[PDB]
Amino acid sequence: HHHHHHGYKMVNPPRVVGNWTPKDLSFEYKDVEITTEDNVKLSGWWIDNGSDKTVIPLHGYTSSRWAEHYMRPVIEFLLKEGYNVLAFDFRAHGKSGGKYTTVGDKEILDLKAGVKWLKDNYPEKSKRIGVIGFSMGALVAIRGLSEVKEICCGVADSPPIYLDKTGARGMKYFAKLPEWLYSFVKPFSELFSGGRPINVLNYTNSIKKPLFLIIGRRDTLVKVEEVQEFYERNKHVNPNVELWVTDAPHVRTIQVFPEEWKSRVGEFLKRWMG
Ligand SMILES: [Hg+2]
Numbered sequence: 001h002h003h004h005h006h007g008y009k010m011v012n013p014p015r016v017v018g019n020w021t022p023k024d025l026s027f028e029y030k031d032v033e034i035t036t037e038d039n040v041k042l043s044g045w046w047i048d049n050g051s052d053k054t055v056i057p058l059h060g061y062t063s064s065r066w067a068e069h070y071m072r073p074v075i076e077f078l079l080k081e082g083y084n085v086l087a088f089d090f091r092a093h094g095k096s097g098g099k100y101t102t103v104g105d106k107e108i109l110d111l112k113a114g115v116k117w118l119k120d121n122y123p124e125k126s127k128r129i130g131v132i133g134f135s136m137g138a139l140v141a142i143r144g145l146s147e148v149k150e151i152c153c154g155v156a157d158s159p160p161i162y163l164d165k166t167g168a169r170g171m172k173y174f175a176k177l178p179e180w181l182y183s184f185v186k187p188f189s190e191l192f193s194g195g196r197p198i199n200v201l202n203y204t205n206s207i208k209k210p211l212f213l214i215i216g217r218r219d220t221l222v223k224v225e226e227v228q229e230f231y232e233r234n235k236h237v238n239p240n241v242e243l244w245v246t247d248a249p250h251v252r253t254i255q256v257f258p259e260e261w262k263s264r265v266g267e268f269l270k271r272w273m274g
């Protein structure tokens, strides 16, 4: 019977909020509020770097824009590279509204809302928009690259590909619960959150924009072979999809190999951000 409460808690996770701000990176910023199509109010930072290009970094499940080992470094990196940055918390994370997360489904509305906000309020600073996502954020980045015409390129670090397999592996990673418990709790999580299945490999047919896939060999959530499958399929229609296989755990390439990560992603963004 405790499956019910597990299912609820996994789509209504506790909030994680850090203490640092872009001022600590030496940049002025604005605290902003972004409203989605389905009326969720998101919390974020708008960091004007005087560019006509903006990059949107997207965080993982149970995390937030503050994540010390990947979000703080990627925001610091983007600002050093000279991009404007819009960094928001996904629904039900950090300081954002929304009771439930759907770990990649309705979160496309969060990204679409951020893109609309840029175009509505700062069009001159968002003539080009790139996305960089980690984990759940990497899935949303892939979906956004396909569905949102205003996004010109994307980086997907450790993207879930087989979502139920990754979901099951996630029981241990996020909650220290057994993998076998996933099939019992998932129907409750679905019921509470309204989250619907996503055919990720379908996006291998629709993405024709530059896409940089990163996957680590020690990732316990996503197999190299799963991301390799996405890559090989997409390369049939996309000459500019790339795959970088690293020796790191889940979303920790930027932590373990910071110089390598920033070098490869920096050059990718320079090539495709206009
Ligand atoms: Hg781009």
Ligand SMILES: [Hg+2]
Pocket: 055, 130, 131, 132, 153, 154, 155, 269
């Ligand atoms: Hg990008």
